[PDB]
Design an enzyme around this catalytic site. Structure first.
Site, short mmCIF file in Angstrom:
data_model
loop_
_atom_site.label_atom_id
_atom_site.label_comp_id
_atom_site.label_asym_id
_atom_site.label_seq_id
_atom_site.Cartn_x
_atom_site.Cartn_y
_atom_site.Cartn_z
N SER A 192 51.92 9.37 69.46
CA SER A 192 52.06 10.80 69.21
C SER A 192 51.25 11.67 70.17
O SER A 192 51.44 12.89 70.16
CB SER A 192 51.73 11.13 67.76
OG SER A 192 52.64 10.42 66.90
N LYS B 110 53.35 14.06 72.12
CA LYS B 110 53.86 15.33 71.63
C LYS B 110 53.35 16.46 72.53
O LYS B 110 53.96 17.52 72.58
CB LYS B 110 53.47 15.54 70.16
CG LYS B 110 54.27 14.57 69.24
CD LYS B 110 54.03 14.81 67.75
CE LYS B 110 54.94 13.94 66.86
NZ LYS B 110 54.61 12.49 67.01
N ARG C 166 38.88 7.68 64.70
CA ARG C 166 39.20 8.24 66.00
C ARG C 166 38.36 9.48 66.26
O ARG C 166 37.67 9.58 67.29
CB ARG C 166 40.69 8.58 66.06
CG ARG C 166 41.60 7.36 65.90
CD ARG C 166 43.05 7.78 65.77
NE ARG C 166 43.31 8.57 64.57
CZ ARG C 166 44.51 9.07 64.27
NH1 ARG C 166 45.52 8.85 65.10
NH2 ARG C 166 44.69 9.80 63.18
O1 U3M Z 1 48.02 9.69 64.54
C1 U3M Z 1 47.87 10.16 63.38
O2 U3M Z 1 46.90 10.87 63.01
C2 U3M Z 1 48.96 9.88 62.39
C3 U3M Z 1 50.04 9.10 62.77
C4 U3M Z 1 51.22 9.10 62.04
C5 U3M Z 1 52.44 8.59 62.72
C6 U3M Z 1 52.58 8.76 64.10
C7 U3M Z 1 53.60 8.19 64.79
C8 U3M Z 1 54.57 7.42 64.12
N1 U3M Z 1 55.61 6.88 64.84
C9 U3M Z 1 56.54 6.23 64.17
C10 U3M Z 1 56.53 6.03 62.80
C11 U3M Z 1 55.50 6.55 62.07
C12 U3M Z 1 54.48 7.27 62.72
C13 U3M Z 1 53.40 7.87 62.04
C14 U3M Z 1 51.26 9.80 60.84
C15 U3M Z 1 50.16 10.56 60.40
C16 U3M Z 1 50.27 11.47 59.23
C17 U3M Z 1 50.76 12.77 59.39
C18 U3M Z 1 50.79 13.65 58.36
C19 U3M Z 1 50.32 13.30 57.08
C20 U3M Z 1 50.26 14.18 55.99
C21 U3M Z 1 49.74 13.76 54.80
C22 U3M Z 1 49.30 12.45 54.70
N2 U3M Z 1 49.33 11.57 55.69
C23 U3M Z 1 49.83 11.99 56.89
C24 U3M Z 1 49.82 11.09 57.98
C25 U3M Z 1 49.01 10.58 61.19
#
Ligand code: U3M
Length: 242
Positions: A47, A50, A227
């Site tokens: 990500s 992005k 991180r």
């Molecule tokens: O890097 C990060 O901080 C992170 C990464 C992911 C993420 C990144 C790439 C992916 N690519 C393919 C499939 C799933 C993937 C998931 C998701 C989250 C995230 C986002 C919003 C949230 C809101 C509430 C609770 N938890 C949450 C968790 C954080």
């Protein structure tokens, strides 16, 4: 120009972790890292992609501005904050993959490839699916390469409009108080080994900017908060933030 400070390894070891932090002092044009080798090893951006994806989408008009609403497609996903409408700000904040997958489809392979070359971004290789290559395709970028790209963005030197760069830097806003501003983006790469977490961005001070890029081994999502925590411990140690 570059100095290795292995004392930062204590911050990873304390958490039974391994990783790299890279810092760049913009005023002095000097870099610092705990691991010169790993600072130059290339990983999937996940990500953190992005950032360039937003720039390209804005510059091509795929995204009009930071207010444009990208409606939830109504497919229930396992991250609750993704099952809702987003704009560029919230899509970045919550790392909303499906919004950015649609960006990439509208950008298309040809324009995506050309733009990443113009950005000198990582290995500039979009091999794989246009809507997933930053997750399981051929693109790779190192921590030092992240810093090079971010420095261009900070200075509005990327080959997109100033407006696009200002909007993405707004969307990167993560933390601000009376002592510093952090603009940054997290990433978590799991589809190809080794699983790693990323945090890349910079710290704005009154009279300097410190760019940073870190990645760390991330076998499970339980450690994702490390991180930022480890990065900030390095920043505190180096007297960059209180
Ligand atoms: O890097 C990060 O901080 C992170 C990464 C992911 C993420 C990144 C790439 C992916 N690519 C393919 C499939 C799933 C993937 C998931 C998701 C989250 C995230 C986002 C919003 C949230 C809101 C509430 C609770 N938890 C949450 C968790 C954080």
């Amino acid at each position: 120009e570059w100095q290795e400070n292995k004392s930062w390894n204590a911050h990873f070891t304390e958490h039974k972790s391994q990783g790299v932090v890279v810092l760049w002092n913009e005023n002095k044009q000097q870099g610092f890292t705990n691991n010169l080798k790993r600072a130059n090893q290339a990983f999937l951006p996940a990500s953190t992609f992005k950032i360039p994806n937003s720039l390209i989408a804005l510059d091509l008009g795929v995204v009009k501005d930071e207010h444009q609403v990208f409606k939830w497609d109504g497919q229930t996903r396992d991250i609750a904050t993704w099952n809702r409408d987003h704009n560029l700000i919230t899509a970045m904040k919550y790392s909303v993959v499906p919004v950015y997958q649609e960006f990439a489809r509208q950008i298309g392979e040809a324009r995506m490839s050309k733009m990443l070359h113009a950005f000198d971004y990582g290995n500039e290789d979009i091999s794989g699916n246009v809507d997933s290559f930053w997750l399981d395709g051929g693109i790779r970028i190192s921590a030092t390469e992240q810093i090079s790209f971010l420095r261009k963005l900070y200075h509005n030197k990327l080959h997109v409009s100033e407006r696009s760069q200002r909007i993405v830097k707004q969307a990167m806003l993560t933390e601000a108080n009376g002592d510093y501003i952090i603009r940054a983006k997290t990433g978590y790469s799991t589809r190809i080994e080794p699983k790693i977490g990323w945090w890349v961005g910079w710290v704005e001070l009154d009279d300097n900017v410190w760019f940073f890029a870190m990645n760390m081994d991330m076998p499970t999502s339980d450690g994702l908060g490390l991180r930022q925590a480890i990065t900030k411990e390095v920043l505190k140690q180096e007297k960059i933030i209180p």
